[PDB]
C-alpha cells in the first residue's frame, strides 16, 4: 500500500514528496550491522514491523569494515534479501554503505562504486530504493568540501547511469552531524538529501537549530539513523530528549530510521535477548527503547 500510493519519491523545494507532489514522511527501523545481526533482517520480521509497528521504510546497515562487506562481501546478499522483502511488502528501503571506523568514505570508494553500480542496476527500476552512500564520515581530517562532496560526486554518477532519480542520502561530517557545511555547499543532483544523525543522550537544542539552518538553505535532510541512547549506542535510554526530537522531526516533516533492530544488550537495541528473529514480539520481548520507538511509529 505505501509504495503503491506514494510511488516515486523526489525532492521539491527541500522536502521529500511523493509522485503527486505531496509531502511524505518515512518512519522505520535500521538493522544493526548485517555481519553481526543479520538474522533479524528477513521478510517475516519486516512484515511484522510493517503490520504491528507501522513502519514504511527499512534500513539495511551494511558495514563496510568491522567484519562487513570489505572483509566478507557475502553480506551484500542480505542487502538484496532486504530490498526484495521491501518490494514484496510495498515499503521503502535504504541501502546503507555503512562506513564508520573507515572514517573517510574515500577509503573504499572503488568498492563503493562497484557496489552501487550493482545495486542500482538490479533495483533501479523500482521506486522503493533509497541509496545511502556513506553512513557516518567522521574525523577532523574528513570535511565536506575536501572529502565527502567529491566522493559523492564520484558515486552519484555511477548510480545515475542506472537509476536517474531515486533518492540518494549523503553523509555529512562529524558522524553525520555537520549539515551546516553541506547546506552551504550543496551537491548538484536534485534528488539528494543530507544525513543527520542524533542520539538522545546528547542535549540537542543546538543540533535542532543547526538542522533548521540547513533546511533554511533549501537542503533536504533525512535522519537516517538516530538512537534513544548515548552516542555509543549504550549508556541509558533518554526518552525525554527523544520525544523532543520526535516532535521536532514531525514539525519539520523529517523522515527517520531508528537504530537498531537487534537483541544486543545495549540501550539503543529495540529487542530483548529472547526475541524471535522472524517477528511476532510480545511486549516483554521489546526493550525499553523498542517499546518507545514502536509507540512513536504506531501513533504516526
Curated annotation (Swiss-Prot):
Monomer. It comes from Salipaludibacillus agaradhaerens. Keywords: Carbohydrate metabolism, Cellulose degradation, Glycosidase, Hydrolase, Polysaccharide degradation, Secreted, Signal. Substrate binds at residues 32, 36-37, 63, 98, 199, 231-232, 259, 264-266. This is Endoglucanase 5A. It is found in: Secreted. It comes from the Bacteria. The keyword Signal applies. Belongs to the glycosyl hydrolase 5 (cellulase A) family. The active site is at residues 136, 225. GO terms for biological process: cellulose catabolic process. Its main location: secreted.
Amino acid at each position: 500500500s505505501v509504495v503503491e500510493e506514494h510511488g516515486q519519491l523526489s525532492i521539491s523545494n527541500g522536502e521529500l514528496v511523493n509522485e503527486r507532489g505531496e509531502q511524505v514522511q518515512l518512519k522505520g527501523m535500521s538493522s544493526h550491522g548485517l555481519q553481526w545481526y543479520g538474522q533479524f533482517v528477513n521478510y517475516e520480521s519486516m512484515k511484522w514491523l510493517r503490520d504491528d509497528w507501522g513502519i514504511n521504510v527499512f534500513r539495511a546497515a551494511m558495514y563496510t569494515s568491522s567484519g562487513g562487506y570489505i572483509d566478507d562481501p557475502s553480506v551484500k546478499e542480505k542487502v538484496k534479501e532486504a530490498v526484495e522483502a521491501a518490494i514484496d511488502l510495498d515499503i521503502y528501503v535504504i541501502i546503507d554503505w555503512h562506513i564508520l571506523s573507515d572514517n573517510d568514505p574515500n577509503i573504499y570508494k572503488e568498492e563503493a562504486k562497484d557496489f552501487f553500480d550493482e545495486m542500482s542496476e538490479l533495483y533501479g527500476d523500482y521506486p522503493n530504493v533509497i541509496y545511502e552512500i556513506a553512513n557516518e564520515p567522521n574525523g577532523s581530517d574528513v570535511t565536506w568540501g575536501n572529502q565527502i562532496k567529491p566522493y559523492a560526486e564520484e558515486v552519484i554518477p555511477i548510480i545515475r547511469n542506472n537509476d536517474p532519480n531515486n533518492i540518494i542520502i549523503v553523509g555529512t561530517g562529524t558522524w553525520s552531524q555537520d549539515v551546516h557545511h553541506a547546506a552551504d555547499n550543496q551537491l548538484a543532483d536534485p534528488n539528494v538529501m543530507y544525513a543527520f544523525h542524533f542520539y538522545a543522550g546528547t542535549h540537542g537544542q543546538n543540533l535542532r537549530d543547526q538542522v533548521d539552518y540547513a533546511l533554511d538553505q533549501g537542503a533536504a535532510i533525512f535522519v537516517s539513523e538516530w538512537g534513544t541512547s548515548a552516542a555509543t549506542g549504550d549508556g541509558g535510554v533518554f526518552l525525554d530528549e527523544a520525544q523532543v526530537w520526535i516532535d521536532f522531526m514531525d514539525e519539520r516533516n523529517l523522515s527517520w530510521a531508528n537504530w537498531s533492530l537487534t537483541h544486543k544488550d545495549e540501550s539503543s537495541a529495540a529487542l530483548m535477548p529472547g526475541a524471535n528473529p522472524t517477528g511476532g514480539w510480545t511486549e516483554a520481548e521489546l526493550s525499553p527503547s523498542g517499546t518507545f520507538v514502536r509507540e512513536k511509529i504506531r501513533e504516526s
